[PDB]
Amino acid sequence: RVSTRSSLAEDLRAIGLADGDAVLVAAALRKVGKIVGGPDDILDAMRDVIGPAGTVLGYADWQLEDEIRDDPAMREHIPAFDPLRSRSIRDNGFWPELIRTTPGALRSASPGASMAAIGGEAEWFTADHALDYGYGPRSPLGKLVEAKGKVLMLGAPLDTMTLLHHAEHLADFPNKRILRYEAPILVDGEKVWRWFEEFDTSDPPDGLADDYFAGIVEEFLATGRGKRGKIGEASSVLVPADEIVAFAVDWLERWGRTA
Amino acid sequence: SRVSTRSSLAEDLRAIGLADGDAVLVAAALRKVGKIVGGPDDILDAMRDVIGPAGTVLGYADWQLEDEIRDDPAMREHIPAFDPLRSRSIRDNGFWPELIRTTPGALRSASPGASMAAIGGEAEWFTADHALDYGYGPRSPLGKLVEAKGKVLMLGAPLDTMTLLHHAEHLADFPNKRILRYEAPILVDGEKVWRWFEEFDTSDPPDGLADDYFAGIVEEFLATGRGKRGKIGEASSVLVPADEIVAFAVDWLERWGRTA
């Protein structure tokens, strides 16, 4: 069947979205199916279910492709990171670009961990995003747990749950990989190369698989605290950010104590 | 097999004919340009560097409607009205018009079928007072482009996608000019109100002509030496004065209707 802004609203209410919720969404918009007014009907329906006080987020990142790090003669030609002009990454899909390009949207300043938010608390999730360790508490992810937010996997593969990288920052497990890279950002309004360091989110900890987030999400849904539903034609899940992070921290700490 | 930079694209745009201050309507196929360092925005950034802050880059936006609005009924109330701020550009000619519209500081026309995204110094002038009915006539950024003696750059896109020539279809005097009538939801007094539109049909060539007959008119105009070709990145491009090819397409169409 075709999905409308009214139809998508009922599908989002059924899966467990309410007024005032702040939900981080990673979406594979192709699985949703035919929509009348395009994929904007999804975002418009969400802002109707959660209201103007609710907030919708999306993992923006940016198109850099690691050709900046050690391809000199590119350095003077790589544009600086601008949280107003830098396009979001196309790895997980068009959904982060849909939020950012929507009028009235905002975008945090940490290049690797940048989130595109829109809604009443969009000014709060994007503000004061730490550059180094951009997945820690001083990030939109940590504020999503602090605000008891939700996460909706709109047909996207479950291993793409970026929120669980915030659990990697908190989990006490031995030998985390410290990733030090150099990226160009805007310092005093001009392009300046800053040295960054964070926990390796491009590769899992030594031992686990690249998609070990998928097993953590499937284990959490087995508890019943999560909800599974369909939005249009895309089978989706909806989990609380505060519980699945604490569930993943215990998952990682339990796995790390085997030393 | 070379890569293009913001500085590299600027020097390529200067050789094709782009200069300071002038306006340029761009229909582009960004894949033909090849690898670019800072993404496709380097193309738009390079133009605004060559044309200066007073120049204006325009793009044919239209909007996503897919003609499912046409007569599919009771799907009528579910169609969001046309918003020159939130309705996205059609994706059939490429990402370029949406690249301009989503760029900060850009504006967008008000005629749904013929809407145009513009950014630059005179972005306010080109997008203003765009007539809903006959959105390709003299009261459109196409007519304002001819008035300001702008240019048209075919950045890898096929020459039959030069939208400016639709403005010449409106000006040319040839018999049996088809008329397209349709209704689409727009914004009247801040609310969605359906409106019947009347315009010269642009989705089909007039009187059994080739669907790509725009490409021939540009190819014949380029034979006069009045335009200029040149590679921008790795894409063969065509820069053409806006006023001269409209006068060329008018005489081409008027003499064609006479010969019939």
Explain the overall architecture.
Chain B: This is AAC3. Chain B: Acetyl-CoA binds at residues 27-28, 30-31, 64, 91, 95, 163. Chain B: CoA binds at residues 27-28, 30-31, 64, 91, 95. Two copies of one chain form a homodimer. With 259 residues, the first copy, chain A, is an alpha+beta fold. Chain A has one domain (1-259). Chain A is 29% helix and 21% strand. Chain A contains eight helices and nine strands. In chain A, the strands form two sheets. In chain A, strands 3-4-2-1-5-9-8 form a seven-stranded mixed beta sheet, with helices on both faces. In chain A, strands 6-7 form a two-stranded antiparallel sheet. In chain A, strand 6 (178-187) and strand 7 form a beta hairpin. The N and C termini of chain A lie far apart (52 Å). Chains A and B meet through helix 2 of A and helix 1 and helix 3 of B.
Give the total of domains of chain A. Answer: 1
Main pleated-sheet profile of chain A: 7 strands, mixed
Tell me the number of helical segments of chain A per DSSP (H or I, 4 or more residues long). Answer: 8
Class inferred from helices and paired strands of chain A: alpha+beta
Provide the β-strand percentage band of chain A.
15-25%
Secondary-structure element series of chain A = HEHEHEEHHEHEEHEEH
Q: Largest sheet of chain A, order of strands side by side?
A: 3-4-2-1-5-9-8
Please tell me what the overall shape of chain A is.
Answer: globular
Q: What is the helical fraction of chain A, as a range of percent?
A: 25-40%
Q: Count of DSSP E strands of chain A?
A: 9
- Evaluate the radius of gyration of chain A: 18 Å
The most extensive contact between chains is: A-B, 21 and 22 residues
Oligomer: homodimer
Distance between the termini of chain A: 52 Å
